[PDB]
From a paper:
Diacylglycerol (DAG) is a versatile lipid whose 1,2-sn-stereoisomer serves both as second messenger in signal transduction pathways that control vital cellular processes, and as metabolic precursor for downstream signaling lipids such as phosphatidic acid. Effector proteins translocate to available DAG pools in the membranes by using conserved homology 1 (C1) domains as DAG-sensing modules. PKCs define a central DAG-sensing node in intracellular phosphoinositide signaling pathways that regulate cell growth, differentiation, apoptosis, and motility. Herein, we report the high-resolution crystal structures of a C1 domain (C1B from PKCδ) complexed to DAG and to each of four potent PKC agonists that produce different biological readouts and that command intense therapeutic interest.
For structural studies, we formed the complex between the C1B domain of PKCδ (C1Bδ) and a synthetic DAG analog (di-octanoyl-sn-1,2-glycerol) in the presence of DPC micelles. The structure of the C1Bδ-DAG complex was refined to 1.75 Å with Rwork = 0.214 and Rfree = 0.246. The organization of the protein crystal lattice is unprecedented as it contains two distinct lipid-detergent micelles located at symmetry elements in the crystal. Each C1Bδ protein chain has a DAG molecule captured within a groove formed by its membrane-binding loop regions. DAG binds in the groove formed by the protein loops, β12 and β34 and can adopt two distinct binding modes: “sn-1” and “sn-2” 26. The “sn-1” mode is predominant in the crystal as it is observed in six of the eight C1Bδ chains. In both modes, the DAG glycerol and ester moieties are anchored to the C1Bδ binding groove by four hydrogen bonds. The fourth bond involves the amide hydrogen of Gly253 and it is this bond that defines the binding mode. In the “sn-1” position, the acceptor is the carbonyl oxygen O5 of the sn-1 ester group, whereas in the “sn-2” position the acceptor is the carbonyl oxygen O3 of the sn-2 ester group. A particularly important feature of the “sn-1” binding mode is the involvement of the alkoxy oxygen O2 of the sn-2 DAG chain in the hydrogen bond with the amide protons of the Gln257 sidechain.
Residue numbers in the entry: 229 to 280
The structure:
Amino acid sequence: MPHRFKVYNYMSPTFCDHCGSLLWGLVKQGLKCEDCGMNVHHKCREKVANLC
Ligand SMILES: [Zn+2]
Ligand SMILES: [Zn+2]
């Protein structure tokens, strides 16, 4: 099954689970998958294997 990513407002300095880099910003810094919890950049969404 595919991931179900949803824009998320990170609070704690959080890193992308795909590319390893920090999720920059105050709000809406990245996507958290609603089913498995994985955090990714908006730009890294298309870059991850879509098996959740
Ligand atoms: Zn997932
Ligand atoms: Zn990333």
